[PDB]
Amino acid sequence: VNAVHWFRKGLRLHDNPALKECIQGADTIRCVYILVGINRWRFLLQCLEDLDANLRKLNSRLFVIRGQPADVFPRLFKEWNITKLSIEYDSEPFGKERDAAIKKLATEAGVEVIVRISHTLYDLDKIIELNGGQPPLTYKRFQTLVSKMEPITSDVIGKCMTPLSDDHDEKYGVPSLEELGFDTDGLSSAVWPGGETEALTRLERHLERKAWVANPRMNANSLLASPTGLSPYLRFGCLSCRLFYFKLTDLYKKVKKNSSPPLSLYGQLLWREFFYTAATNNPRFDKMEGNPICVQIPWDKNPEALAKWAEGRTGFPWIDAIMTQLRQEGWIHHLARHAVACFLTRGDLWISWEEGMKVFEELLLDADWSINAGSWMWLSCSSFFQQFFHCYCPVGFGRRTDPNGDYIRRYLPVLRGFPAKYIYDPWNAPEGIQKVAKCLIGVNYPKPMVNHAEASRLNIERMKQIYQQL
């Protein structure tokens, strides 16, 4: 009779099978959302504003509640006389633990829990069954398992109604950044605007781009936020990965013949799936110690080095530029992640991937518990059989990605006056050049915090020797 849909990810009305099923046989439906850096919070709140606005258009509203689910749902169930609760499935270990506790409470209150998988393409548990009860520990094996697996104008609440009270905006309104305790004087408009509406606009354009302008290699421009980038939208569920996957496939077929498209066309999607699968039964996935798939590495504790890196004050412009864009905007290119993750961990500073992961959790829009832990193990060569015999150069990688160094000048204006010859290694500029640039190295911008040549040589050696050498 009275039903609730509970938003956590899946922050969208399109491709929402849990919501659709929840509404079957229901008199009433209420959609609820139960409440570290400012960009993440802004993105979430914009998602919630978008949902509320779109629900409004259907004579509904989003119900935002501040509290712990375990403390909220029982009295909600009683007040509203709820007998059905639906959720999109969450594979993440702390998510499963949360949802297990809420199921217990719901069973206690006579409340049916409806669970549908739609944050991912696949049933992750079935992949694990196909692999003998443990996740594939290499991306290639995962690709093989899934190949042996698979083959918006409506009113999503049309069959139901939502009771609404006059004080809804007050009681159940989406909070503002200020209400969450943020200072807002220091924000321009978001580079990555939140919400389903935006996601669906970007999807169309994304697909237009793949068809028209393309049918894809790195250039300097790729380092900047694309207006057709989808990765934050996927992580929040603003864009269904299944919709994305289906649209891609059909357009590929339209444009290219039959063509059994390359795995590379689904790389974004499959890599995220791979880490969710790796994480789902591993409550220590975000740890080194006690984590069964993590190689144990003698990382060092250097809180000042970690802070220099986190803050973009390493003295390597390439690294600092990247960490500055990350903090300013909330997204950086996957190749830029390689650079700054390699620098912090196996390459230059020898600091645990756990520590890098924490910073990214605070700043990176498309990071969640599974993806972020997974990526950081991958980039530090702590898991997934990744190769540690090469170390990204914190000068050359940048110089090969943006030869002119505009990216540097863009995120590090203090360096704007250096010529391209020195913009990735300003410490090598003659002092007169530094002076013309109005930037003395050591004074206005720091010296490089490490000798890359030595650091990288020693660390590759030390990583090699953690393993038996033949």
Question: What is the sign, positive or negative, of the torsion defined by CA atoms of 436, 438, 440, 441?
Answer: negative
> Per the annotation, does 268 bind a ligand?
yes
> Per the annotation, does 367 bind a ligand?
yes
Q: Does 235 bind Cl ion (CB under 5 A)?
A: no
d(CA 293, CA 278): 9
Q: Does 9 bind Cl ion (CB under 5 A)?
A: yes
In this structure, what is the dihedral angle of CA atoms 355, 356, 362, 367, given to the nearest 10 degrees? Answer: -120
Taking residues 258 to 297 in sequence order and writing x for each that binds Cl ion by CB under 5 A, - otherwise, the string is ----------------------------------------
> Per the annotation, does 166 bind a ligand?
no
Neighbours of 147 (CB within 10 A): 10
3-state SS assignment for residue 30: strand
| Residue count, binding to Cl ion (CB under 5 A) | 4
> Per the annotation, does 368 bind a ligand?
yes
**Residue 238 CB, nearest approach to Cl ion (Å):** 8
In the block, tokens 């505009």 appear at 406
Phi and psi for 134 in degrees, rounded to 5? -140, 150
d(CA 379, CA 21): 40
Distances (CA, A) of 4 to 95, 155, 302, 391: 18, 17, 48, 51
> Per the annotation, does 286 bind a ligand?
no
Note whether 127 and 277 are within 8 A (CB). yes
Phi and psi for 283 in degrees, rounded to 5? -65, -10
> Per the annotation, does 52 bind a ligand?
no
**Residue 201 CB, nearest approach to Cl ion (Å):** 18
- When the beta carbons of 15 and 320 are compared against Cl ion, the nearer one is 15
Site for Cl ion in 75-134 (CB under 5 A): 119
- When the beta carbons of 88 and 348 are compared against Cl ion, the nearer one is 88
Taking residues 191 to 230 in sequence order and writing x for each that binds Cl ion by CB under 5 A, - otherwise, the string is ----------------------------------------
**Residue 118 CB, nearest approach to Cl ion (Å):** 6
Q: Does 10 bind Cl ion (CB under 5 A)?
A: yes
Considering only residues 136, 237, 356, 374, which one is a binding residue for Cl ion as defined by CB under 5 A? 237
**Residue 102 CB, nearest approach to Cl ion (Å):** 18
Question: What is the sign, positive or negative, of the torsion defined by CA atoms of 292, 293, 295, 296?
Answer: negative
List the binding residues for FAD.
231, 268, 334, 366-368
Interface contacts to Cl ion, rule CB under 5 A: 9-10, 119, 237
